[PDB]
Symmetry: D2
Subunit: 243 residues, 4 copies
Amino acid sequence: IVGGQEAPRSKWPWQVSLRVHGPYWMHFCGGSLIHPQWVLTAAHCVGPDVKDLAALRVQLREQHLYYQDQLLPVSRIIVHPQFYTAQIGADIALLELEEPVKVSSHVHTVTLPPASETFPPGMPCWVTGWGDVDNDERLPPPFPLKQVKVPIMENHICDAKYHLGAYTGDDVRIVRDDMLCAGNTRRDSCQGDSGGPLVCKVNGTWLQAGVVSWGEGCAQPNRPGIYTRVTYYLDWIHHYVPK
Amino acid sequence: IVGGQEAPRSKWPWQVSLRVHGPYWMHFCGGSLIHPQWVLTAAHCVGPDVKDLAALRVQLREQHLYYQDQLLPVSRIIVHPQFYTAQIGADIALLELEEPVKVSSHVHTVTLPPASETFPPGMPCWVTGWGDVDNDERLPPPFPLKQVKVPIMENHICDAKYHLGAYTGDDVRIVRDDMLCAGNTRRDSCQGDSGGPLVCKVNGTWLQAGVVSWGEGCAQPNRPGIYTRVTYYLDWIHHYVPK
Amino acid sequence: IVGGQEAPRSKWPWQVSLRVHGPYWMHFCGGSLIHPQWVLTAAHCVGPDVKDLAALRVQLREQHLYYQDQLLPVSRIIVHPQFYTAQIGADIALLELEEPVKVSSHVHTVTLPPASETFPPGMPCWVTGWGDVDNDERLPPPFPLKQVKVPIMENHICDAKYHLGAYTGDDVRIVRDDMLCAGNTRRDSCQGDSGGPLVCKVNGTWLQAGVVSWGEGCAQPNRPGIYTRVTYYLDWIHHYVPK
Amino acid sequence: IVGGQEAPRSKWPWQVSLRVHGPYWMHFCGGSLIHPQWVLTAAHCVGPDVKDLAALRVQLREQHLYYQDQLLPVSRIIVHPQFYTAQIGADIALLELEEPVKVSSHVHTVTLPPASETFPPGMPCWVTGWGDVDNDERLPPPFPLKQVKVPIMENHICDAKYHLGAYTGDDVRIVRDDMLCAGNTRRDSCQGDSGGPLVCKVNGTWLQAGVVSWGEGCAQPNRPGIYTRVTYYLDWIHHYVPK
Ligand SMILES: C[Si](C)(O[Si](C)(C)c1coc2ccc(C(=O)N3CCC(c4cccc(CN)c4)CC3)cc12)c1coc2ccc(C(=O)N3CCC(c4cccc(CN)c4)CC3)cc12
Ligand SMILES: C[Si](C)(O[Si](C)(C)c1coc2ccc(C(=O)N3CCC(c4cccc(CN)c4)CC3)cc12)c1coc2ccc(C(=O)N3CCC(c4cccc(CN)c4)CC3)cc12
Ligand SMILES: [Cl-]
Ligand SMILES: [Cl-]
Ligand SMILES: [Cl-]
Ligand SMILES: [Cl-]
């Protein structure tokens, strides 16, 4: 997270951390608890090439990474079959937990938006994670969960910004219709935040609008953060996750 | 270049090296001389973002990098407007030199293929360059130009390989129709070879079939190297370079 | 620490961590609390060149680095004037804290040895710290304090080992008389453990025999760890620290 | 070499490069041809631990490293038996070549000084090598041999300078009697120049005064380059090398 601060312990009860087996169970990507037995994340965290399930675990909301880990095994990785790279799109994946989590006020699910939900330009949303704090700047120990408030950007404007200072033809889409943009040169998600949630409070209810997907660096001029648009893939999500 | 060997001095008179300004004028991609005032390279080497032309120079065929440099400045960088990433396609670009080069038996242009040549499996083709000699292994000093003979794999077969060990659906195309596949687990191009030539001997004449573009690593199982298919982009090239 | 295990919370109440200011207050050496206002460490951790005192802080016994830091600033750095490198000797230094620490069962001083204790082979001795767990392997998060029991090797025997596989003449002393050897190819201190304590239980009391100083790598054949012999430097220490 | 320039091809016919076996025969240290069958170098380049002779070769004077290598095998490494580290001293070694070199005006021996030779403070001398061009700045390709003119410094002054900004007692020697100092904040030897020659023209004859040994960084305030004093070790040298 670039330009944020450390999150209050009471906030973001759905945030998860994805961990890969090595010398330790290291954080590589974020995710969100969308049902007691399912995590929503980015396909590029876990694909497109097939991964060993035994080398992956999930960690539920933690103030500080690694300090009080209680690692959860995963029973299935479901990567959207249209995914090959984040720039092409379909950057979305599900992880089915081995058990349902017992929900509490401290760890619980996020609400998905209705199909019709339009998160309008300017709407204040929040992105969270334990990613880098700037380009090539790691989150320092003790690895607090960070948050930053970022406004939704309209696709057409976000696409136009990506074309400024580029050779790419103006009518050739960079930011595609299954993607959503947020952030500026002071506030953004960054590497390690991938797969985590962009959430917006709509009439007082928190809805997950996006999944951290990609961008050109973090907080760079004319290069807002790009997210997979959750509304776009609701039907695919609902094919596996109970409503 | 993975596999193969140091090129004889008499071969590949069209090979160029692209250099970026820093503590020294460092090699970062290859290219080919297609006209005395024009170099053909990969878009990903010089885009999609606009770079400072003053910080780019070209070196004509050299047996060893850096030893006998005579760097040439560039007046224009022209990048295919469809280009955004190598995995999407249109990985092709042109550099106009500030002056025409004087040609000779040692340094001269390569012939572009007619629109109809398809470069089928079994054709004798070579890829050349100063890139890495295996995944994450640098070409050692004194940096000789390398060459390797690479076998063509038909696009549909190549695409099908790219789907083995992938989540990507089998009918979601990975290797696109403007690309070409060649190489195996002993013979391939690698990082630093990008933008250079794949040339095939057709009826006694060397034609440039491909521009080194991408792949999943270098010389990995089921993952041939991918080239930009030059025939696909002949009309574009001819918008800029005289016939 | 190579080998051994995470220390129980009740053990080594004297262990400290030295921190250098940067993107975070990073652990770079250990130390020991020898008086409420004084820490004993290795000279090589803080010298021979004079450093900015404002950029140094000390953390008292913590089970996990960084998680619950309460950093304490330093008023004086006193380095043995014979010191230039660890291989020459006099690898010993004192830090005066700006305030006295409040002691308890969890955090308190270690007892210095009488001038006459020699710490012979067979004595039960432990070395503790947050350093590397093998040559060039970092202690992973969450950075637990480690301990390992290390066997003492008599100085002359240790010196003779240091000469095996060396050009150095056998009568040119390597392990000097102000040093002490301990450890083997399974149990040793390592980088990041420097400046911390080697403690040996003598007649029911824990005494600090050694300060972690140097060695040829960590847990390597014929190369025990080398410590600064605390008894050699008692008079110096007592020039500064009250009895 | 810090602050130098590329050497004329006619200069320094005694300079050699020491090469270690890996992915290529990489330069690690300098040396000097002091007899047709012997190279003078620093012991820290090849010790104090015993090295495999088969993994070492010598390269005679070359304008550019790696370009025209003709690598020479070594038949004996002789490391001064008093050597353990450069800061202690005796940082001097001999390599006996498998054959005598055939001398020419382009490659030939350097003259050693007489025992009595005093290279006085201020005398202009030259150091040469293919080392780093500043702290942590590698010599760029095509790796030219560099030179820089450096004045001799008196030991007592050099020792005093090393004490400025240090905790080390003023009467505790840092720069020892077998060492010689030269250089300033604009001109110095650096890592990779080790073992190469410091040469001074005395009444029109070039004599080797020093062997590049160590220092605190390169070209740092109050930290001149330190060399092994060749006069000090003449008798040891003459024990193996014919006069
Ligand atoms: C994940 Si990749 C490594 O991405 Si790119 C550097 C190619 C990339 C393409 O578009 C981009 C657009 C942006 C960024 C970028 O700036 N990022 C940093 C910031 C980050 C980020 C993350 C989270 C949030 C935010 C928002 N602020 C940003 C997103 C990535 C990176 C990119 C990649 C995608 O598909 C691939 C397919 C293959 C490979 C691959 O294996 N290689 C590349 C090709 C190479 C090769 C070279 C020559 C010849 C051959 C033939 N043998 C091979 C071998 C190694 C790599 C990839
Ligand atoms: C200890 Si240092 C960093 O030197 Si060494 C790595 C060659 C060393 C000398 O003896 C040793 C003996 C052992 C080890 C070693 O193996 N270690 C790894 C393990 C570690 C350790 C730590 C804790 C516990 C244990 C026990 N298991 C071990 C101790 C170090 C290392 C060494 C050193 C001491 O005094 C110095 C003074 C100066 C410098 C220094 O600044 N430089 C070296 C010289 C160099 C230079 C080169 C050519 C010309 C010039 C002139 N401009 C300069 C510039 C950079 C470095 C040092
Ligand atoms: Cl919340
Ligand atoms: Cl040819
Ligand atoms: Cl204890
Ligand atoms: Cl000369």
